[PDB]
């Protein structure tokens, strides 16, 4: 049936309307990176112009409208420096970000993996902002903006909010290079959280 077998949307360009509340419908365009094995309704998408990877149930989320699967399967690119790319995986990093002033701020983070499909991009998360980001880190490294420093999957989670309520979600991925680190998807939001889970 539709989007089955060889028509699987992973690896494809998509576009769709996006609407929140009574706001206007806007067009989102992106590349589908992955389908979550423990929740096959859930896809991971890199949207043009959004630095965070989003998890959306593309066929179920009422905010999504007019979904189009484009005739455009994203080809792999050749990595500019294979040894450097492999070396970054699992490392702590300091990632430089320029701002309004032109002042440049250094954010401590961890390189998680090469991104699927968009294979010159890297999964990365930050100590101060523990969700899943995606950047072409070899470019940033070349420009002097990156310094390299020297099963729970499928389980329901409940995060203890300060107001006494519990935020529900699911563990969706275990980071191969650092298997104490997991991706968590909360039911109420599309960011992918990335945490080193400390047993307690």
């Amino acid at each position: 049936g539709p989007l089955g077998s060889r028509r699987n949307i992973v690896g494809c360009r998509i576009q769709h309307g996006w609407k929140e509340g009574n706001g206007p419908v806007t067009q989102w365009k992106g590349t589908v990176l992955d389908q979550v094995p423990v929740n096959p309704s859930l896809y991971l998408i890199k949207y043009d112009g959004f630095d965070c990877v989003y998890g959306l149930e593309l066929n179920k989320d009422e905010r999504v409208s007019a979904l189009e699967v484009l005739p455009d399967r994203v080809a792999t690119s050749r990595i500019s420096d294979a040894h450097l790319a492999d070396t970054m995986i699992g490392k702590a990093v300091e990632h430089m970000f320029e701002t309004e002033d032109g002042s440049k701020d250094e954010w401590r983070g961890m390189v998680l993996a090469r991104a699927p499909v968009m294979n010159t991009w890297f999964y990365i998360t930050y100590e101060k902002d523990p969700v899943l980001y995606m950047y072409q880190l070899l470019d940033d490294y070349k420009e002097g903006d990156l310094r390299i420093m020297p099963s729970l999957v499928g389980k329901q989670v409940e995060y203890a909010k300060e107001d006494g309520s519990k935020r529900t979600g699911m563990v969706i991925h275990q980071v191969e290079a650092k298997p104490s680190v997991y991706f968590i998807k909360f039911d109420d939001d599309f960011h992918i959280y990335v945490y080193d889970l400390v047993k307690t």
Binding site: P130, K155, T200
Partner: peptide
């Protein structure tokens, strides 16, 4: 890389998360 405390609740089969 950010850390989170995690305790499995075996009766409810839920991972309880709370900050360090």
């Amino acid at each position: 890389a950010a850390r989170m405390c995690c305790k499995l609740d075996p009766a409810r089969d839920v991972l309880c998360l709370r900050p360090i």
